[PDB]
Amino acid sequence: KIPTRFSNRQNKTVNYNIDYSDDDLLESEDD
Amino acid sequence: RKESYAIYVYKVLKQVHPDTGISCKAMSIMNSFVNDVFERIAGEASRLAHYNKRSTITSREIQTAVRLLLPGELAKHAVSEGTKAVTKYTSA
Amino acid sequence: TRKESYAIYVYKVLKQVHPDTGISCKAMSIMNSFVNDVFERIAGEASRLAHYNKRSTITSREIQTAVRLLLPGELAKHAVSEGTKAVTKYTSAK
Amino acid sequence: AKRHRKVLRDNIQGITKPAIRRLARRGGVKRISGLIYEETRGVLKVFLENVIRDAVTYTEHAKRKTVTAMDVVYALKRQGRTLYGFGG
Amino acid sequence: AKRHRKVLRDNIQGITKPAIRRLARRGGVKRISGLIYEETRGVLKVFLENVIRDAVTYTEHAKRKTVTAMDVVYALKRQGRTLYGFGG
Amino acid sequence: TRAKAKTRSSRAGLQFPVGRVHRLLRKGNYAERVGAGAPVYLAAVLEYLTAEILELAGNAARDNKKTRIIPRHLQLAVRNDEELNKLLGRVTIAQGGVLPNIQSVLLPKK
Amino acid sequence: TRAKAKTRSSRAGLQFPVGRVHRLLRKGNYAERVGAGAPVYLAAVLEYLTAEILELAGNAARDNKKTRIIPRHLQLAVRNDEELNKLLGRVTIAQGGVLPNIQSVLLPKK
Amino acid sequence: KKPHRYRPGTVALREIRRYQKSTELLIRKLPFQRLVREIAQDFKTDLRFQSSAVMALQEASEAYLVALFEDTNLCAIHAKRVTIMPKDIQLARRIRGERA
Amino acid sequence: PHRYRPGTVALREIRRYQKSTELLIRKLPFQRLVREIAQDFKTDLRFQSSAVMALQEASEAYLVALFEDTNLCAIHAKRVTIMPKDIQLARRIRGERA
Numbered sequence: 001k002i003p004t005r006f007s008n009r010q011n012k013t014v015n016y017n018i019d020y021s022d023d024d025l026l027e028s029e030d031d
Numbered sequence: 032r033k034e035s036y037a038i039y040v041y042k043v044l045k046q047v048h049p050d051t052g053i054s055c056k057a058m059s060i061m062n063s064f065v066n067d068v069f070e071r072i073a074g075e076a077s078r079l080a081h082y083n084k085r086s087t088i089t090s091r092e093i094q095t096a097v098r099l100l101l102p103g104e105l106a107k108h109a110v111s112e113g114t115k116a117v118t119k120y121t122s123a
Numbered sequence: 124t125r126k127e128s129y130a131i132y133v134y135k136v137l138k139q140v141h142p143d144t145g146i147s148c149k150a151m152s153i154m155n156s157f158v159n160d161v162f163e164r165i166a167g168e169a170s171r172l173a174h175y176n177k178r179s180t181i182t183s184r185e186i187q188t189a190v191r192l193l194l195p196g197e198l199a200k201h202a203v204s205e206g207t208k209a210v211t212k213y214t215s216a217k
Numbered sequence: 218a219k220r221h222r223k224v225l226r227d228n229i230q231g232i233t234k235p236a237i238r239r240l241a242r243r244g245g246v247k248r249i250s251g252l253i254y255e256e257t258r259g260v261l262k263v264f265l266e267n268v269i270r271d272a273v274t275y276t277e278h279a280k281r282k283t284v285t286a287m288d289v290v291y292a293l294k295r296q297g298r299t300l301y302g303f304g305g
Numbered sequence: 306a307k308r309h310r311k312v313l314r315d316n317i318q319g320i321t322k323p324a325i326r327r328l329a330r331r332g333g334v335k336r337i338s339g340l341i342y343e344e345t346r347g348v349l350k351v352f353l354e355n356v357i358r359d360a361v362t363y364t365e366h367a368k369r370k371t372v373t374a375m376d377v378v379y380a381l382k383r384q385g386r387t388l389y390g391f392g393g
Numbered sequence: 394t395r396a397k398a399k400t401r402s403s404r405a406g407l408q409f410p411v412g413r414v415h416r417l418l419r420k421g422n423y424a425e426r427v428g429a430g431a432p433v434y435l436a437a438v439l440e441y442l443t444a445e446i447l448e449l450a451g452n453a454a455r456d457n458k459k460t461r462i463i464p465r466h467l468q469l470a471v472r473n474d475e476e477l478n479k480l481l482g483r484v485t486i487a488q489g490g491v492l493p494n495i496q497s498v499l500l501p502k503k
Numbered sequence: 504t505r506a507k508a509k510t511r512s513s514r515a516g517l518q519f520p521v522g523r524v525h526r527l528l529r530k531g532n533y534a535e536r537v538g539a540g541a542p543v544y545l546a547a548v549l550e551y552l553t554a555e556i557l558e559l560a561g562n563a564a565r566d567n568k569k570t571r572i573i574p575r576h577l578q579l580a581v582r583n584d585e586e587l588n589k590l591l592g593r594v595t596i597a598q599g600g601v602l603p604n605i606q607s608v609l610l611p612k613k
Numbered sequence: 614k615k616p617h618r619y620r621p622g623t624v625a626l627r628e629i630r631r632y633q634k635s636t637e638l639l640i641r642k643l644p645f646q647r648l649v650r651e652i653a654q655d656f657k658t659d660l661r662f663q664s665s666a667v668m669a670l671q672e673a674s675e676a677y678l679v680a681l682f683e684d685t686n687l688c689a690i691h692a693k694r695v696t697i698m699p700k701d702i703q704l705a706r707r708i709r710g711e712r713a
Numbered sequence: 714p715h716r717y718r719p720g721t722v723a724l725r726e727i728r729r730y731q732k733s734t735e736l737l738i739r740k741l742p743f744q745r746l747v748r749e750i751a752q753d754f755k756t757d758l759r760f761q762s763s764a765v766m767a768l769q770e771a772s773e774a775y776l777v778a779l780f781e782d783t784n785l786c787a788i789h790a791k792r793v794t795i796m797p798k799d800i801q802l803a804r805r806i807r808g809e810r811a
Binding site: 158214 | 509511514515516517518519520523524527528531533534535536537538539540541543544545546547548549550551552553554555556557558560561564565570571572573574576577586587589590591594596597598
């Protein structure tokens with residue numbers, strides 16, 4: 001459940017979600 | 032009888048992420064990474080022992096190789112980790 | 124203090140290739156550094172070649188393979204020659 | 218003349234134009250000129266022969282005729298391009 | 306206020322603009338913009354901290370207080386910048 | 394009357410094998426002698442680096458809604474952390490891909 | 504009788520010391536054992552590379568009206584040779600300078 | 614002969630965003646095997662190849678070409694262009710030290 | 714008043730300094746810079762003279778190679794004047810920056 005080990009290094013959080021949406025490109029796609 | 036690092040990497044993974052698995056290719060990559068870091072640190076410590084006319088490799092040579100190869104906060108956190116492991120191993 | 128170096132051997136090789144040409148001390152330091160660097164590179168590659176093949180000894184085959192790996196192109200091709208006959212001449216004597 | 222040679226010489230042309238275009242798309246390239254592909258094929262051939270020569274040297278040191286994956290890993294490692302996922 | 310600090314902090318300004326111009330002349334540069342010198346001072350400082358930090362690590366391993374030239378050669382060789390003419 | 398044998402990893406409080414690291418140091422042609430605390434220290438450093446990359450890769454797998462770490466998650470974890478990126482700068486991870494980024498001059502408009 | 508103690512360099516017809524190379528290979532932590540022909544081969548290769556640089560450096564000293572090889576002549580000999588510029592391509596020679604090279608764009612147009 | 618043609622560049626941006634997400638090899642396996650065998654028969658005859666050796670060669674070659682294309686794109690952007698040219702590849706390999 | 718056109722003096726300096734071999738940075742400012750950089754790592758550091766000379770020779774070698782690649786970047790951008798973005802591009806492609 002809860003991890004027994006963590007990191008003491010002061011890293012910033014990183015969004016690792018590499019899923020992309022082409023909704024900002026619908027101007028030259030369907031509109 | 033393949034002499035890998037897979038079970039120890041698995042135990043470390045269950046320490047940091049108890050409900051996350053790992054594929055075979057990722058395990059091979061992790062084993063290659065551990066072997067690469069081992070040979071880098073051991074080669075740097077061997078060079079450090081040869082530079083100082085010393086016939087032995089101690090924890091000081093490993094510590095200096097860690098501070099030479101690892102950058103930034105990785106270096107000092109690995110030094111703290113290895114130092115407290117050596118302290119725990121000596122006292123007991 | 125006896126400090127070893129490749130000074131006299133580089134000097135006599137120079138007298139072979141250029142009998143009327145001298146050399147400065149900084150150039151001898153650079154030549155000594157070159158010989159030490161190439162020795163370290165070839166010996167390290169031969170050590171790795173012996174380790175990958177699960178062999179406990181370094182032979183002339185390992186040095187030949189290290190020379191073929193490290194020395195680029197035709198510089199290898201003559202040097203592989205230049206080592207080999209020397210080994211052959213050593214076999215003619217010892 | 219139905220008979221010809223078994224060997225093939227235009228195997229560098231097997232790295233096609235859309236393959237180089239896909240490799241440039243992975244590199245973030247938006248527009249590609251038409252002279253890119255021959256230069257890319259020459260660069261790939263130079264890199265491949267540089268790796269393959271060292272791998273073949275590692276193979277003949279072991280007195281073998283089969284180029285294993287470990288020889289390719291060592292050949293890539295010596296020139297400073299460490300590759301993971303095949304050394305274990 | 307005749308008294309001031311004994312230590313000096315503007316030693317990166319001791320690498321003067323004519324010195325950077327001479328370095329660019331040896332590099333073959335014909336025309337130099339006015340913002341080149343600050344960037345050159347920055348990259349020289351970054352390179353010097355890297356080499357000096359590795360050399361200080363090599364010094365501190367040997368339990369010494371002085372920094373020898375051989376430690377500098379070790380620090381440069383560890384960064385893939387081997388230097389001939391100072392021993393080794 | 395031999396005592397109850399316990400591993401050196403349990404003495405050092407580690408998960409990585411101290412004895413295997415000591416045997417690889419002794420047979421690796423690094424020095425004539427190997428000290429006692431050197432395999433302990435090196436196993437601790439290797440375990441810490443494995444812990445850092447495995448935690449970052451588990452975070453990468455969680456952010457992509459997956460329960461198993463694949464080479465893509467390891468590549469994303471390594472390349473998104475700059476200290477691990479410059480530790481493995483000359484290292485190619487197979488089946489890892491690249492970081493998704495597009496240069497700002499290639500974007501169409503505002 | 505002990506056959507007057509003929510050296511291995513004279514047996515191999517070399518000028519580089521075979522015995523010193525053997526001692527440096529044995530004490531250099533490279534392998535458990537060192538073969539007999541390995542120091543002969545390595546000394547011959549080192550002697551050939553030394554002769555190859557020194558011939559070109561003597562030619563560079565002769566072209567500059569000098570009877571003494573300085574670091575500048577070594578740098579000119581190394582950088583002007585195509586295959587010596589790949590063996591020492593990541594190597595700085597002190598007091599060596601650079602090759603005189605000006606790009607053709609920067610030349611004046613007549 | 615249909616309407617609603619796409620602007621030149623947004624399709625390329627779609628393939629940029631698509632191929633930077635995926636991780637598969639972008640070169641077909643059989644032409645790469647033929648290329649590797651054709652290159653390798655110059656150095657030595659009667660050479661056998663493991664499949665994992667060719668796969669490692671393909672992974673390394675694709676990574677090298679992708680990194681070179683990133684440096685080439687930076688070269689082309691630096692020259693106030695958005696089209697890559699052989700001089701951009703030449704400058705990237707010269708600065709990298711391959712042509713130096 | 715005798716004058717030279719802008720550029721021929723630059724070509725004369727390029728021909729002069731590519732022939733010479735001495736260091737183009739003065740000794741004491743570089744020594745002061747080395748000591749200032751070194752005192753941020755360890756206090757009370759002594760220095761051999763040959764260590765400062767080796768650090769110097771490495772520094773001019775690195776900067777001359779960087780200026781060569783900077784000139785290549787400037788020529789590729791159809792310019793004869795080097796810019797800080799040329800240094801940034803050279804260090805980016807070389808791999809030192811990113």
